[PDB]
A paper describes a structure:
IgE antibodies underly allergic diseases such as allergic asthma, chronic urticaria (hives), chronic sinusitis and food allergy. Therapeutic anti-IgE antibodies (e.g., omalizumab and ligelizumab) were specifically selected to compete with IgE:FcεRI interactions, and not target IgE receptor complexes.
To gain direct insight into the structural intermediates formed during facilitated dissociation, we solved the cryo-EM structure of an omalizumab variant bound to a partially dissociated IgE:FcεRI complex, using disulfide-stabilized IgE-Fc:FcεRI complex. After five rounds of selection the majority of clones converged on variants employing C02-VH and HAE-VL sequences with sporadic additional mutations, yet clones with the tightest locked-complex binding in yeast shared a novel mutation distal to the binding interface in the E-strand of the VL chain (clone A4:D74G, clone 7:D74H, and clone 16:D74Y). The resulting disruption efficiency of clone 7 is lower than any other omalizumab variant and this decrease in efficiency is caused by a single point mutation outside the antigen binding site. In this disruption-intermediate, clone 7 scFvs occupy both site-1 and site-2 epitopes of the IgE-Fc homodimer in a pseudosymmetric manner. One of the scFvs is oriented with its VL domain adjacent to the IgE-Cε2 domains (site-1), while the other scFv VL domain is adjacent to FcεRIα (site-2). Notably, in the disruption-intermediate, density at these glycan sites suggests that they reorient and adopt distinct conformations to accommodate clone 7 binding.
Author numbering:
A (entry chain K), G (entry chain L): -1 to 110
B (entry chain J), F (entry chain H): 1 to 120
C (entry chain D): 228 to 328, 334 to 544
D (entry chain A): 6 to 172
E (entry chain B): 229 to 544
The structure:
């Protein structure tokens, strides 16, 4: 356990539609090198395949809506959604990509 | 484009040996975008295991390497993994993925379906 | 003994605070006994020729007072560099310095399929604009999503007449990677940024659809008849990027004579573009087949598509 | 009791601040052991100084003279971004003056500034306007962001999940 | 000979900081000499004489006079308009200055919609709207002033207040138009007036001028494909006309044909200095089984005697 | 558009009478805009005389008011100026113009050639 | 009498082609009304009809180069020209348009 451990906050949330909802995962040490944060964002679909959400901690892969917003600084990093949709119930993850081996958070599932 | 076929879930005794496979549907893997194996323990954490790219440059996890190896066949477009000397805690869900490069850092477009290994 | 008194005055901003195109920097050296006096100026430390400034030493008995004006343009002050009028007097050194009391846009080219299919020479240009210059590094990074070691690109500059500098760069490409859609990332850096900018694209997505290409003819007018105009249509394809061209008698027809339209999508989710071309008299007396050819990806077999349409 | 000059706490990189705890040790019989991240300090006086701050010196901070009553874990916020609301105090008691201001990178010229009650565009003005709420009340908590005109481009600053303590 | 006045002023340092005192030496030269009384004006009123420290340097007949004033820093940073004002031989020779700050203290944006010839030559009932953007929702009201150049009485306009989704407020206003006054080019102006305003933003317009030119028209249909035997398309050609505002319309079987089915291209010039624009519209099956006369029609000013040229078409 | 033909200039005698004219090419002058007589003493200032609008509302220069009359004919689409009791100072150059208004404040964009009338 | 007495400044001038020149009509009272002064500036070429140059002292006439600039408020009212051409060297005028009768200057002629 000599590497950076990843702690998400909160763990799971019951919600409703259209809500402006937010999560935060935390690291131990800061690796923000060259003005770059080497973090990525992930979603498994429960019973099915995983999915990258955001690469390079700010950039979305092609094929998503725009209702989603990741941010933060240092070891504190934070993802936000402005409006809930019926398709939004899954399990969600963040992950670092600077110093190998690459570490993971505990995971986050959303309820209603 | 590219499509993925994992293979090899089952029940094997601890401290034994087995082999894996990971079938590629749509690209001659010899030319770029690293070829990788992934663990996830269900109900628990996640694991990048190892990483081998097209020129044959390998990387492993230091806590795990010393008992497991990885093989390759790009003409059959299929690469594999022989496992050895496993304990009870290696019961997990196991994934296969495809590296994509960015500035010395790598990522997957591709996620497996995940196969279940259950070892006592 | 008295040491000299050095101060600096300048031109003036008016009753609305506007801009003379030339600024006058009057470096005064007052209150000193005469002796050994030689004066210089240092623009960022660097000196220029001795014919940009003017001085009139006023000597009042045992005292003296030197004035010294330097005239430059406004744009040197808008260049925001530092000027240092300096006098040598008895070894004891006194001086003063004065300077003046941004954005960064970039683009990316998408070349023609002629340069891909027929000229067959892919060299991608990455485009940076609004280079308001500094003194530090502009360290650029042409880079690849596959990350194989790259070849070398272009590097040029130009001071634009609205003031600004620029840099773009052009890197050669292979063809088949783009045929397979490899993605790349030109990337400049600068120290003054709180954060930097990345940019990338590649060959487009989706399925593929071929178009319905046609072209027809015009009638004449009672006014004049020797100068007519033909035009080209296309419709209902995917994707959109197409070299369109113009063929007659093994001659690349001149570009500025024909006008083309913009790619708009059809209401039935395909795309459609049109064009236009004037004709004149004596060429139909020569020959009649003038080929509006084009290059769609799904065109067959060599991405070849035209209708040889003529007159009569 | 930490007396922070300036009482603003969230900063960019490479910046300077005055760090001063208790004024009851005004005559200072015992010196002050400051605790970056728990780690014991070296400052002779009871005032600590930062010039041109580092990211890695941030985070949890405490001090003490020699009494069991140790100071509070104070947390620090070094940044490098484009848009920043800027605050003095979050855990605010009732009836207190509240301080509200937004900040631009390297303190530059931003216009057309809307303050946001939790999504609702509560107060616009053409430029910056340091908002005061001189007395706290019940319905004041929330999560408040900012918007403006940056080099003609337009972004949105972070929203801050403000909590009110109610006595 | 009359003098000319120029101002030479203090410099911010290498750090760009203002000096705490400001030395205002106005240089005055170039006059057949006489009596000289310089007054200083802060915002137009005569400043005190004691802080004016003048100097009269004269070289033969050339007199390079110079009058120093001394402020503090925020005296200048009060953004007041300061002035060196010489009176020469009974005349007055004056130079002004003011604190030079940044720019653009508003930049309000508004719009105006000159109507369609359809509402001039077909419907012939024009209503013009002037359309203000970026309105601050506040307390003090606006005072709108629709206005003319001919000075003749007006009808009643509109006023459309709405708080905007992105936070601001919106007001536009609409007025009906007479016909021939625009045909003879009458000029109109709606005017803002608000308590926030140190200025006022006004825009005016009339009929756009130039020479006159009549166009040339064709239209062409779709020779069918083996795939589609019922669904075809039309398109209509125009060229060489001036000035270039058109209502374009579509006629078939005494039906003003609908809109979102069709589309229409943009005003683009020709090398022979006319313009050329196109449009398009699909074909369906049963309509030609009903009737076959179709007109892409358009409304040009130099079209005559009914401001239109029409071309009925048929199949094959 | 409107074109101007001044008519009625030359040598005149003092303390008498003179009817002016200025011919308009291209308007019905009863419609709108003011119709104006403007004078220029050569080597000296600029002298507005009088004005009549389309309805016939009428203003004079008060310095000259009491001496001069302005007439009109909109069927002829020409307006005139019957000036009486001439003076020695009336040697001047005479420009007819049309009024163009904005908020009750008027302007004359157009200018004739201007006709010198010299009293002798 | 009580007319706002104009003071054009200067009386006349000689220049070269390309000179950035500035000129003021000076008044006595303020016609700033609703934040607006009612003032136009003029010019007549020698042996020709006059020509209005800018209406309301802020709004151009059509068909001009943009190298000119008017200004001023209260009783001070100012025109600035940035680049001089030979066809500009003539006599120029200005006039108030606020309270009737409307008054006039002496005209300032520029030479080359
Ligand atoms: C000083 O004058 C310079 C001389 O023109 C100008 O520099 C210009 O910078 C602009 C910045 O937008 C650039 O203009 C175009 O930039 C790209 C390139 O597209 C076209 O440029 C080619 C040559 O540069 C042409 O051969 C082709 O027509 C090509 O298509 C475009 O992306 C821009 O369009 C728009 O880009 C974004 C995307 O929508 C818009 O948001 C912008 O508003 C912009 O309009 C421009 O077409 C270009 O580098 C250069 N101008 C040209 C044509 O050479 C510039 O006007 C001025 N600069 C400053 C700082 O004042
Ligand atoms: C809050 O949201 C508002 C939504 O109402 C924003 O209003 C929008 O403002 C922009 C800029 O003012 C408008 O863009 C164009 O404005 C007019 C209107 O164009 C058309 O608007 C409607 C479509 O939205 C149509 O239904 C109308 O028929 C109308 O034709 C155009 O005239 C402008 O053109 C101007 O700029 C072009 C270049 O782009 C120039 O070539 C022209 O000369 C001209 O100067 C703009 O293109 C936008 O349409 C408008 N939305 C409306 C009215 O529906 C508002 O900006 C936003 N506020 C903030 C602070 O974010
Ligand atoms: C802003 O974020 C704060 C987090 O600091 C939120 O305040 C928290 O609200 C939750 C909701 O109950 C509480 O946290 C937990 O409460 C349970 C029982 O109430 C308790 O057993 C846990 O120990 C924990 O405290 C608590 O009231 C409060 N947490 C703290 C420590 O402040 C708040 O929801 C967010 N929103 C706003 C607008 O304030
Ligand atoms: C913070 O860093 C230094 C230290 O204050 C500032 O730079 C200057 O340092 C010299 C050294 O004596 C002094 O003139 C001043 O202490 C500083 N000048 C100013 C203007 O403060 C630097 O500017 C400060 N900037 C920040 C907030 O990062
Ligand atoms: C200090 O914080 C760092 C995070 O960078 C952490 O790894 C370490 O455990 C902390 N402890 C020390 C050394 O004070
Ligand atoms: C990959 O390419 C090599 C080299 O041509 C070839 O021998 C091999 O059969 C190819 N494999 C696949 C799966 O296409
Ligand atoms: C101008 O209008 C008057 C008013 O009736 C009329 O008598 C005259 O004939 C008109 N002239 C022209 C040229 O229309």
């Amino acid at each position: 356990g000599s590497d950076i451990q990843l702690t998400q906050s909160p763990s799971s949330l019951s919600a409703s539609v259209g809500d402006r909802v937010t999560i935060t995962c935390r690291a131990s040490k800061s690796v923000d090198s060259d003005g770059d944060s080497y973090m990525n964002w992930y979603q498994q679909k429960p019973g099915r395949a995983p999915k990258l959400l955001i690469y390079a901690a700010s950039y979305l892969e092609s094929g998503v809506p725009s209702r989603f917003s990741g941010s933060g600084s240092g070891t504190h990093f934070t993802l936000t959604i402005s409006s809930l949709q019926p398709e939004d119930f899954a399990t969600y993850y963040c992950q670092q990509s600077h110093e190998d081996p690459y570490t993971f958070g505990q995971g986050t599932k959303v309820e209603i | 484009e590219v499509q993925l076929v994992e293979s090899g879930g089952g029940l094997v005794q601890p401290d034994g040996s087995l082999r894996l496979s990971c079938a590629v549907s749509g690209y001659n893997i010899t030319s770029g975008y690293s070829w990788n194996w992934i663990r996830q323990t269900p109900g628990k954490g996640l694991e990048w295991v190892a990483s081998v790219t097209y020129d044959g440059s390998t990387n492993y996890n230091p806590s795990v390497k010393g008992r497991i190896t990885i093989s390759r066949d790009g003409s059959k477009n299929t690469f594999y993994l022989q496992m050895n000397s496993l304990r009870a805690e290696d019961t997990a869900v196991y994934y296969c993925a495809k590296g994509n490069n960015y500035f010395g850092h790598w990522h997957f477009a591709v996620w497996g379906q995940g196969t279940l290994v259950t070892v006592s | 003994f008295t040491p000299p008194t050095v101060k600096i005055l300048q031109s003036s901003c008016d009753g609305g605070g506007h801009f003379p195109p030339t600024i006058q920097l009057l470096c005064l050296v007052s209150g000193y006994t005469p002796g050994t006096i030689n004066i210089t100026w240092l623009e960022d430390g660097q000196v220029m020729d001795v014919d940009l400034s003017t001085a009139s030493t006023t000597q009042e008995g045992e005292l003296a007072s030197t004035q010294s004006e330097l005239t430059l343009s406004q744009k040197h002050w808008l260049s925001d560099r530092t000027y240092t009028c300096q006098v040598t007097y008895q070894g004891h050194t006194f001086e003063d310095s004065t300077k003046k009391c941004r954005c960064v846009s970039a683009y990316l080219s998408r070349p023609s399929p002629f340069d891909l299919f027929i000229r067959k020479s892919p060299t991608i240009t990455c485009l940076v604009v609004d280079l308001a210059p500094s003194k530090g590094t502009v360290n650029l990074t042409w880079s690849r999503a596959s990350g194989k070691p790259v070849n070398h690109s272009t590097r040029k500059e130009e001071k634009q007449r609205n003031g600004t500098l620029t840099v773009t760069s052009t890197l050669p490409v292979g063809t088949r990677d783009w045929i397979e859609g490899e993605t790349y990332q030109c990337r400049v850096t600068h120290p003054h940024l709180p954060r930097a900018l990345m940019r990338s694209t590649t060959k487009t997505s989706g399925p593929r659809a071929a178009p319905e290409v046609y072209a027809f003819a015009t009638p004449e007018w009672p006014g004049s008849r020797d100068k007519r105009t033909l035009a080209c249509l296309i419709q209902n394809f995917m994707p959109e990027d197409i070299s369109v061209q113009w063929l007659h008698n093994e001659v690349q027809l001149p570009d500025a004579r024909h006008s083309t339209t913009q790619p708009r999508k059809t209401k039935g989710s395909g795309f459609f573009v049109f064009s236009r071309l004037e004709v004149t008299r004596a060429e139909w007396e020569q020959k009649d087949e003038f080929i509006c050819r084009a290059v769609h990806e799904a065109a067959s077999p060599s991405q070849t598509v035209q209708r040889a349409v003529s007159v009569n | 009791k930490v007396s922070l000059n300036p009482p603003w706490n969230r900063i960019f990189k490479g910046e300077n601040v005055t760090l001063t705890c208790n004024g009851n040790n005004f005559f200072e019989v015992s010196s002050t052991k400051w605790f970056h991240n728990g780690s014991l300090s070296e400052e002779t006086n009871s005032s600590l100084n930062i010039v041109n701050a580092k990211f890695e010196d941030s985070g949890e901070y405490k001090c003490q003279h020699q009494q069991v009553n140790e100071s509070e874990p104070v947390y620090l916020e070094v940044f490098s971004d484009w848009l920043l609301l800027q605050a003095s105090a979050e855990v605010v008691m009732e009836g207190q003056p509240l301080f509200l201001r937004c900040h631009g990178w390297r303190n530059w010229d931003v216009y057309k500034v809307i303050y946001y009650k939790d999504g609702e565009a509560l107060k616009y003005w053409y430029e910056n306007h340091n908002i005061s709420i001189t007395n706290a009340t019940v319905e004041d908590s929330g999560t408040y962001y900012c918007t403006g005109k940056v080099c003609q481009l337009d972004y949105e600053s972070e929203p801050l999940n403000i909590t009110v303590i109610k006595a």
